[PDB]
Paper text:
MiD51 and MiD49 specifically interact with and recruit Drp1 to mitochondria and then facilitate Drp1-directed mitochondrial fission. MiD51 does bind adenosine diphosphate (ADP) as a cofactor, but MiD49 lacks this capacity.
To understand how MiD51 interacts with Drp1 during mitochondrial fission, we performed crystal structure studies and solved two types of MiD51 crystal structures under apo conditions. The overall structure consists of a central β-strand region flanked by two α-helical regions and looks similar to NTPase family crystal structures published by two groups. The Type I and Type II crystal structures are almost identical, with a RMSD (root mean square deviation) variation of 1.14 Å for 329 aligned Cα atoms. By comparison, we found that all of the released crystal structures of MiD51 from PDB, which include different nucleotide forms (Apo, ADP or GDP), lack distinct conformational changes when compared to the Type I and Type II crystal structures, with RMSD variations ranging from 0.97 to 1.88 Å. And the ADP/GDP binding sites are almost identical, which implies the structural rigidity of MiD51. It was reported that MiD51 can form dimers primarily based on the crystal packing of MiD51, but we did not observe such packing in our two crystal types. We define this area as DBS2 (Drp1 Binding Site Two), which is located on α12 and α13 in the C domain and forms a surface for Drp1 binding. We also determined that MiD51 forms dimers through an interface close to residue C452 located in the C terminal region, although the majority of MiD51 protein exists as monomer.
Numbering used by the authors: 133 to 463
Amino acid sequence: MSLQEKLLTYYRNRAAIPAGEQARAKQAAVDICAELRSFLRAKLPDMPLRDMYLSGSLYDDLQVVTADHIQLIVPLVLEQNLWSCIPGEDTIMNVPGFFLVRRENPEYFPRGSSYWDRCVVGGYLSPKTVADTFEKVVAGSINWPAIGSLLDYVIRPAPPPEALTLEVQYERDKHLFIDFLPSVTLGDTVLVAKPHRLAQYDNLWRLSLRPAETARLRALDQADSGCRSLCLKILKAICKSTPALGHLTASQLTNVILHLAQEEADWSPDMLADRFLQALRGLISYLEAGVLPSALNPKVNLFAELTPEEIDELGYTLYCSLSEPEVLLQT
């Protein structure tokens, strides 16, 4: 049979979402998203935000390759007057590519001049505070299954520390997750409050990379009708199924593939199996080294959040795969 054929087989059987189901999944998210606006259009203002949006509603599949959960961005509006963002590199700590947001010009515009002065601690805008002030609309200031009833789904938020995340069964067989993620844009630079992990103590703002990451990927495979996304989807599925490998994230996997695209031109369909093995060796190499640089921002190490016991486990599992990759398909 061969790896190629087995990989394709695993794709269709374990990894891929049927066109129909996918559409219905998109519908759910788009509907949930609509109604959450209707909840905040009533509740607010006070908090200054643009409309919530779902990334990337332009693609059907919705970027659930690159991935984790469907992402519901909530853009916080800030005065470009009153706020500068300081790179994590130039701290006061030392943590690329996270950023501190510094309250500027008390020198001019005293406290109370912004809504966002109520989420400052120590001269700096605080993703955790911001996330919290937020999380106490979610789990559960919402009249939750009243919107469940309206649309014929089950909508319940995961219990903390993911009160931001939501579970929705869209059909009876299947279920689906939606992340709320607060975002601020200060000039060129866009940031999200996905907390760091340790964060020292608590904590900095995270540079958003998923949308750029998914755009390169979309584009490369457009260029040459190549098999980069397919190869990624399969690694993602294997990692979702194989408990040892669960510690690996969408972003990590995505960046392994992007580095491999930098190194290899070919990605014709018949190259799947080789590129697949190379991703495994790439992973092993990045894990040995303890660093996976972001393809888009080489100073950022995506493996910096992994605990060393995780790295340990992953490396061993991958090391053992290499001679019989077939075993990864039967988890």
